[PDB]
């Protein structure tokens, strides 16, 4: 007995076959799911749920695993995910795809780091190959983004309600822009909140000048309707608050006792007046409030809510430009709850909600998703949210890339072209990649279900001629097109990160000789 | 496959669970679809806690019937939302959709791949829907046109002779609760229960009714007149927020201590009291209190030596009801004390029952809130009417919310079909097929009620399927002769919005059920 | 969750595999492990190997049936080409190795194809037309036909590939022992059936003192004396040597005294007087496996005759055929025709084993026998199993003819010769073709694995040497010049038909373990 006492350990090809096996799986778990006519899953969470979606991420999210490198190969969905949203019905399938060629030149007994070194080669290439054959749009044009939005979105099952998400997601993208930051201002899709509501009908469910909140008026008295509010938002609770320092009293006599109880009502009625001074109309904090003081802004006659999330607080303030407050005392009228356009408490069925809207140019925003089941609206936002990331990356970069596997073609000739030209051993690993960036319009073929190897021929063919880099395959006819008139179209940063994430995962891959288990630590 | 990836792992595959999950509907529309219609029987649960349904709304059911198949845990959500918006026809929905994936799973059985035919559903359900749109029928907020729709839905549930006592309560309700634009149906709809004399009587009352009562015997049990005090600020004793250790050295002081405590509840109730004795300077009006909180009982003798009626620890939606009541200003302080702050009421008793206490508001000129009282010979009936009552509610609400309104029975489907059927392939040619059994789906409304009644089916829907002439009409199907009935006529009718969001849901959920292929399981231990 | 359904509960649990996936996947993988098996198997430059087998017995292997033949592999299609390749063996020997290395080449690229989305029957039909175009092409590269039929030395120049390529380091004792072996038999019971050799194992005297004998051994006992007669004059009796008792149960009867000592008295003289008859005809030697007369053997001392003992029905079968003497049932009648003659019989000892020999000069033709010398009788049954294969190997060169060029350079003009009509073929198959055209280069790729050079280039050169008709230039066997050697002049040839069925017999592995698409497995 020596080493570890029962952790096991393996080394080399075996090792080497094994993890490219596992990814060969790993990637192949998914290949049914891109494309606009790919399929869509539905999963079973351990504790009972129901999640149902196309995104691979969150479906390998939700997977569980014992080979590492599949989970290795796991987090790299997820990371490009969170970078880039989508891709993720692809990103994965080109990973393992490029390990599974990547394998064939290991029985060639040839040494991984060159087969890496060239990898390095390729892809400098491949970001220049996109670079050439990438097309800046204006950022102003909203009917392009809206064509690419829906380019963007026509994989998912909200493509029958294209136009209202494009719309949807370009209004809330819009209206996010943070110019303190002089002309560096930055969008942040955290503002961007999303409400999801069961019933109605996806045509309800709209993009609301404001925030909406899943609580009620304290009290009856205060109005549930106005027009131009005036908003608080008190980080302090409202109430009597404890002497942190483990305050005592000792009285001695009798009218001591009823004299400090006054005091706390005191206290908070104190508090009361200093509110009503700036004349506001809303009360908002994140903490719980005295009765008796909204007694007193009932007295007032000054809408009051109670204990809200203080993420929503900053949205709240981020709907009508104010600044939260702890400090009654030190309140200040600069944030004074201007900009409100209209003040109302509907009634969703068995729920108020907080109705805030027609904020002058309102920075913050809340989607309101109105369906039929939160599994599928769930499912719907999730959608959503890579339908609003890839368009702050288009309000990232202008320069766009005519996807459908055109330009996937376009490299793969380039680096061909490449190839020839750079004699050498390496030279069979740089075509094998080329090789490997086929499949995905392969793939695609198979989603439509067509003739895979007649049309992929033809397209390489179509695409030896350099007079014609637009030429794709369309999702549904599954026939060459040229994508200026099909018009799926793709942020170049998208594909970017795609090959970068791509060959990342390849060399981590490679570089591995050997398992070791049962750490103890 | 991934099986690879994990043993413990579990998958299916497109052909596999694709008929899992419409063998799941099928079996599941299957034991439901006994309901519906005003025939179908309402099922009786018991719970491994020993407890007892008497019910037929299928969201009770699916949400109590234990079942782990995972489309009817999606199915049930659904549902669920149906019953969060409209509450019946949640029976007809479920109906609705496992039909349609069984007519759909004849054309996949079929070698047709479903992505075709869910767009044939997404052109069919627009061309119903625009139907539908059309065909509504905008009706005003007669009584009588409400009340046929409450019967209506109301016969679902229960007796005939039951909800035709159970309809005019309901109605004269909402003509009692609008403020002619929005209804909320909380505050005004107080539903309360007890097990008292019977399942009819059964009744609005006019007034209010409380779930607690007095908590002193010399307290009067009834009032003629009532001068209403709303409010939550606790008449109990309570210390100050602060640690306040204090200390005598007298047993004097102790004394002296004993009434210096009291004194701020004691100044509190005083407040009232002379706003009583300001308020009530005559001998016959009668004083009543609401506190959200509890009193004290040295308040409580306080207000007993003035012979003041005082009620404890209330629920925050009551007194709401109660300004909705009696018009009084609900509040905290007692300083800032006005008698136009006040309530009155007409009348007050306090009803005592078993071992609990009821209490009652009645005679308010204008009342504004009213409640539902359930009068129970058995608790599972009152839970039973309970869902039944809060169904033909909220039936009624969409029926004054949406101006327009469908009628019932089923002779929108056949409506449906026949326009349906009637749609040429404009479409690509093979949606028609999918349109054809979306349309073929549609008619099972009437089948099942053909079927829950007994009467064959077939011949049924061949003679309803008759659209006579030019006016072809708007024909329903007997409830009880299995004939052609004008509902519009009979007055069978329903919400529009039910309609329209159950198509809409049913729809989606087609097509995103059809639209899976394997149902994964691979979870930590 | 915890809760799946299943639309056909028709298992009651078992293996049901489906949707090309196993296919496409699982069986290829399966296939994939067995060229990973065996990928050293072959070669010259390739090594041995050894396993225990579930009884716990040892083998040292370089022949892949053999070892193919201890492994209890459960995947089903794995089996069929293990069947395969040993089926092959029982037909030509070595190449067992190779055909599995066609297997998985032919598999590699195959599912690659179908991954492709090439038609799995269209796949089968190109699979199909290619190998059968191959067998077209393939007489067309014979050269050297060896003919001369009796000669020591070309067959020993022959044999010496199929020996170098199971054994690289002793090849010239074992081409002249089995030449010795060879010439030694001729045409006697049709054509040197391989059965006619005899293989004695013996441990101990590495294996240079191993030798051959123009004879038969036994590794048995004596009960007389010891003796060589160059006149040898053998009795063979397939009946026990003794007093023929009746198969029925006939017990000897008396009825009065004088019975008991005439019964005695009479059983020997009867006994001595069948002996004696035997030993007027001269016969030296008197051979049973059956049980032996104690007096007898009394007498046979008396007569002085040799005895032999408990062989086995081919034991005598094999020692009938070298003597060309009639076995004989019936113990009396030493017939002179069906008599036995040896140039010389008698017992040595070697390696403290009893060793009854029958040494032999036979110009009618003998079936010899090869003595084995040497410490590890694992290196024995090595060493006897290549040797088996160079007499299977010679056998199947002594059916028709035609030597033709090993060391792969064959298969790279196949390859050529495919390739080219590939583009030919024009269609979807024609990437078919062209991926089993493809498919040969495993093996000198293989033989450069098992080089232990980079085989790529050597291929290219080999290639590029090939452009120029070059069909008898190949793969050299050096670390040195891990370039190129002269096959012909190397003397490196193979059998046209050993190559010829396995390539069909890899072409029918293939298709069938293509053929099949969704699987069931009942439990063990």
Known sequence: LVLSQNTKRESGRKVQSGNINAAKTIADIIRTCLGPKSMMKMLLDPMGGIVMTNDGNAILREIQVQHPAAKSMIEISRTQDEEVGDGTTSVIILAGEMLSVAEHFLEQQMHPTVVISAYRKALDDMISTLKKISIPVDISDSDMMLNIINSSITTKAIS???????????????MVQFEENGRKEIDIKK????????????????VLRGVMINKDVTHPRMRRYIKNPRIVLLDSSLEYKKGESQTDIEITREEDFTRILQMEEEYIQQLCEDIIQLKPDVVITEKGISDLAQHYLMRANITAIRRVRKTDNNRIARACGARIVSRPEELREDDVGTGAGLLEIKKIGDEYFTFITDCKDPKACTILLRGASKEILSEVERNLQDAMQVCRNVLLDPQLVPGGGASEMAVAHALTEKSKAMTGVEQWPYRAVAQALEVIPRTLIQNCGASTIRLLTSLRAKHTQENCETWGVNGETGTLVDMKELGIWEPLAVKLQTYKTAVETAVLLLRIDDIVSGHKK | AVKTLNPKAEVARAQAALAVNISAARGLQDVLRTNLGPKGTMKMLVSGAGDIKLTKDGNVLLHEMQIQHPTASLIAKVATAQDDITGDGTTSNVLIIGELLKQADLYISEGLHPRIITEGFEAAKEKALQFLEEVKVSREMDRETLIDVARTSLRTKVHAELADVLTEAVVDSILAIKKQDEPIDLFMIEIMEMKHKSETDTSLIRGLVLDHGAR????????????????????????????????????????????????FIEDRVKKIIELKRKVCGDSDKGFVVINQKGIDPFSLDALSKEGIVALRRAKRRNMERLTLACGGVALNSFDDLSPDCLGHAGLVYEYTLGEEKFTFIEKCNNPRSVTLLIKGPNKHTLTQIKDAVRDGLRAVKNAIDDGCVVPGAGAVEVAMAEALIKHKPSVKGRAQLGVQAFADALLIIPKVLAQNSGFDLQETLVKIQAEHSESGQLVGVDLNTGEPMVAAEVGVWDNYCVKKQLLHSCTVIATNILLVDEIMRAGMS | PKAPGFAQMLKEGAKHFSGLEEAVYRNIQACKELAQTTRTAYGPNGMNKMVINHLEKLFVTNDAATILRELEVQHPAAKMIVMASHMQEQEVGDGTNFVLVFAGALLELAEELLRIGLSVSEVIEGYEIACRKAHE???????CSAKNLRDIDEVSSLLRTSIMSKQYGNEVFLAKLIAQACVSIFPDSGHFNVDNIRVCKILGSGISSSSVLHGMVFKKETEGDVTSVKDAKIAVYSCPFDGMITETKGTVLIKTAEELMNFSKGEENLMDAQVKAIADTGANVVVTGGKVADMALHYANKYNIMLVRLNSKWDLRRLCKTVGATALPRLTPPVLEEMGHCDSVYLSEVGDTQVVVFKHEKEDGAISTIVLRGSTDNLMDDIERAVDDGVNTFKVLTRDKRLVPGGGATEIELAKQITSYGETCPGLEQYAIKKFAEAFEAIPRALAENSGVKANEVISKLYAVHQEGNKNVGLDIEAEVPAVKDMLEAGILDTYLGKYWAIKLATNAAVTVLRVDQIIMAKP
């Not at chain 1, 029958?160 to 494009?166: F, I």
């Not at chain 1, 503002?191 to 709209?206: L, M, N, Q, T």
């Not at chain 2, 927020?241 to 004394?255: H, I, L, P, T, W």
């Open chain 1, 160 to 174: 029958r309600w294209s136009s209202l998400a494009c719309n949807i997601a370009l209004d809330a993208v819009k």
């Open chain 1, 191 to 206: 503002y961007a909140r999303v409400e999801k509501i069961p019933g109605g009908i996806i045509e309800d469910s709209c």
């Open chain 2, 216 to 263: 002193h015997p010399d307290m009067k049990k009834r009032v003629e007149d009532a001068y209403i005090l709303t409010c939550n600020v606790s008449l109990e004793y309570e210390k100050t927020e602060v640690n306040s250790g204090f200390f005598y050295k007298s047993a004097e002081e102790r004394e002296k201590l004993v009434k210096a405590e009291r004194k």
């Open chain 3, 137 to 143: 092409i393939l007489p067309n590269l014979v050269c």
